Amino acid sequence: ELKKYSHVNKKALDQFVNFSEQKEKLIKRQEELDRGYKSIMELMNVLEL
């Protein structure tokens, strides 16, 4: 059994738990930037008028 269990990278539990948290912290900030993008696009249309 263990001869075939030899080729696979370790610490995947640590990786997945860490990197999901970093994914979520990038998720909320990237969700913020587009909201600010439409906000400034609207305010540009205001300034033009």
Add this chain to the structure above:
Amino acid sequence: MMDSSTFKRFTASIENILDNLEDMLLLGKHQLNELGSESAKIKAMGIMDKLSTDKTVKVLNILEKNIQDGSKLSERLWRDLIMERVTKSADACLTTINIMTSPNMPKAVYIEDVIERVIQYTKFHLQNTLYPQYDPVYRQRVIVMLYNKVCDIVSSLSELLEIQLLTDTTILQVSSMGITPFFVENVSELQLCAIKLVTAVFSRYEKHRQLILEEIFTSLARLPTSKRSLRNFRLPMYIQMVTALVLQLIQCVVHLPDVVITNSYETAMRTAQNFLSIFLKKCGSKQGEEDYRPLFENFVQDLLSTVNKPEWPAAELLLSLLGRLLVHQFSNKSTEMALRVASLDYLGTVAARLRKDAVTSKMDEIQQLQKALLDYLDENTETDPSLVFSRKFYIAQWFRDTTLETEKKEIETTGQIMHRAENRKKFLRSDTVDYDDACLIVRYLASMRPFAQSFDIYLTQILRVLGENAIAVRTKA
């Protein structure tokens, strides 16, 4: 003393009354505190001739104790909090003392679950508590005593890991902690203990070299970069910590048992050259928002600052590899601008202060000198441990010196055969000399090796770069 069963029965009474009153859920502070205090030395010889299954049940009991604050996730409840961590830290002390106690330790009087538990306890509680209030960037005597317990437990952890093999699922995170505190401020003695740990894990296992160097290069930007207490390692002449860390990685791998010496020693220079090559190539280019240059300058002045002391070798090997890398890179035109000017600057610095050291230093006989120095450092290893690795590195060094002498007649063959026989006798063998005399004889040995006698040759390299196709580089050359 062959038994000294005069407090052996005192401690044995302590654990039997304990497991009677608990087995038939906490044991409190004071009893276990005094239990660890007596466990420091009283059982350090007397742990033998004790009942094994009782050891298993007590380590299971204190395992279940350390379960409670294992990843504990934590004005008056704070007293309960602090006493909880101090109680479980004393419990950790009992674990890390109890396992290591015998010089010969019978198999399976332990389970790796409790060592895993003390490891994760160490991880969480250290990163939660001690770094933020000893380093404000991450942000009464109880903190200090907890600190001292941390130091003792990690030292015992280091020598316990050297005692016996552990699984890689422990190795990864114990190496992580062994490297972790090297980027905060007031942790120097912890950094010595971490040096001991990385000696254990590094010399014991050959399969994590890549691992260790990658976590080294990851968080180099977290260095304090402060004028206050940057150099705190006595040899005046205090030095920076991670430089000595690099040095003891270099001298730590020997794998002393034939040609095993030669292949392990060339493996050592290969591991060193991969380390310095990757470190240099990361340093050379200017990355966004930061730099690795000042790391490289302070690192190298410390390196040549510890160039010639008989218990810090291979700095000469670092400088030879430095010369080889610099002549490999800056002679071309394809390499990037910052790497070339960097290498030329470090060449100028080493050449200048090497020159002043050269002009300020000097102004069976070889076998006699070798045996006298090796006796003196044998005394030193009897006094100061972990320098046996430097001694074995020296043995490998003389073996390869006799090698390169052999390939560069029959009388020289007889002489090198006699030196080989002496080296193998001292391998099988494995006064009143002073530190100053040791320094003089080791710089004499360095003078014998064709290393300092290439300075003008390096100047010759400068002569090869006097004419260039790019002005800026030769201007600052």
Add this chain to the structure above:
Amino acid sequence: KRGPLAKIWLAAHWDKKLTKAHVFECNLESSVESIISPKVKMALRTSGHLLLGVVRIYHRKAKYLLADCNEAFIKIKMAFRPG
């Protein structure tokens, strides 16, 4: 010099004294735009300068978040094979 809008004055006019600490978290862009929208006595050119400040800091957040994603790219690619 002084004021919640002083950093925007530095961004619009000086732009050299700005550091990463102010860029990352000192103010919310969506907050400050609605701060500046109904203000009285607002001269046209000073409004243009405040637009400079907010556009500059927003694009700097985009560059720094791109950077953040880059070191994220380095940290996700590592792996351990004993072989």
Add this chain to the structure above:
Amino acid sequence: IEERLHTLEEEKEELAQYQKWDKMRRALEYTIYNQELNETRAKLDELSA
């Protein structure tokens, strides 16, 4: 990142299986070496007699 995370999630179950097999193998190894030391003791006393 999302697909890389999913791949490491299957590899996370894979490592769970691998480590379960690893501990039970080590337990079996220790058990058979207990058996070999017991037989050893037996053989020793038998040969002494």
Add this chain to the structure above:
Amino acid sequence: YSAHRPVAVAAGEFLHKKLFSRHDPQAEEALAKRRGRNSPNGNLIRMLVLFFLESELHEHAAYLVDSLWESSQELLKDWECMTELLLEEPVQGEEAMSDRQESALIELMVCTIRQAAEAHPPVGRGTGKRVLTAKERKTQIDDRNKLTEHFIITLPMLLSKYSADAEKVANLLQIPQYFDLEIYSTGRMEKHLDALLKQIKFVVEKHVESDVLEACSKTYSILCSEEYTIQNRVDIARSQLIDEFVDRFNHSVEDLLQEGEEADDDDIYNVLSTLKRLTSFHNAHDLTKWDLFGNCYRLLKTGIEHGAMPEQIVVQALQCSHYSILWQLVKITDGSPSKEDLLVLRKTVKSFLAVCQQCLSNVNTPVKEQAFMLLCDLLMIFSHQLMTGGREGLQPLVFNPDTGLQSELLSFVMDHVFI
């Protein structure tokens, strides 16, 4: 030796100008400070020693060193010079370092290094208006560093040369009060610490003097600083030595208390010496984990019943029992007071009170004074101000004075004080 410090300092500056011309001609360097060797400054040390010998107006050079402090700052930190002129017989071909001269030089070193650590002048010269500048404090710190690294080396063979000299050991063990113990963690010289621990263990087992035992106990208490990493390593040696002394005390007491033959002077000497050491090291250190109040109280009760045995044994037993009682009193204000051991401790205190009252009624007058002061300690322990520090469960412990005991105390005070 003037009481007024400026006058004394002016006189000492004059003395330094006058009587120091071995190789300093009061002129330029390259022959004046040191000739590159470990020899020129020896004679300056020599007439320092001779000046301390002839100055019979003082048994200690404290005022002399304080006067010569600022004038000879560079000379008084060169400790290595008289270190070879004290231990390892220098190449100058001089005579043997005289024992009176040895004690004089050791007293000079006591004075110089204590003024090196603390800069305040002694009493009578004291001011109390002292402010530390940055230069002062950095000189203090690196002075501490250099004396620490020098004297962790020198004190092992210093003791090896002067193990049997009681007063020299007592003088030499005041310097470790001024040693930064984390330098040992940085210097990695805990092995030399342990060598000095074994050496002073040899002194302790070779010396019976109360003063040197006090000095050793104070030295241990200084190096029993739990804020430093070495506390376990030193506690090893402390526990080892006190365990040896517990075993020796039990072996000697269980044969001394029985009449037998005789008890002779040898068993008396062994019991007295062992109890002296135990009392001395029990004053500064919590050693109640080895409950020897049984042996001490048996000795005190047979002193009460018989009364024909030496004074000093009873004095040591009473003081050791009092030390055990107060060390138990330490670990009841720790926030964890029980009740069974509380009543047990109160009963032992009451028995100690009866023993102290008997010793106050005993004819021996130093025993009377010691019983009086022990009774003073017992009453202030159970005083009304015991309730000040936010305590509740200590109320059963409180014991009221006896009127007859009060009259006995008044009679003792009037017969032995107001004279």
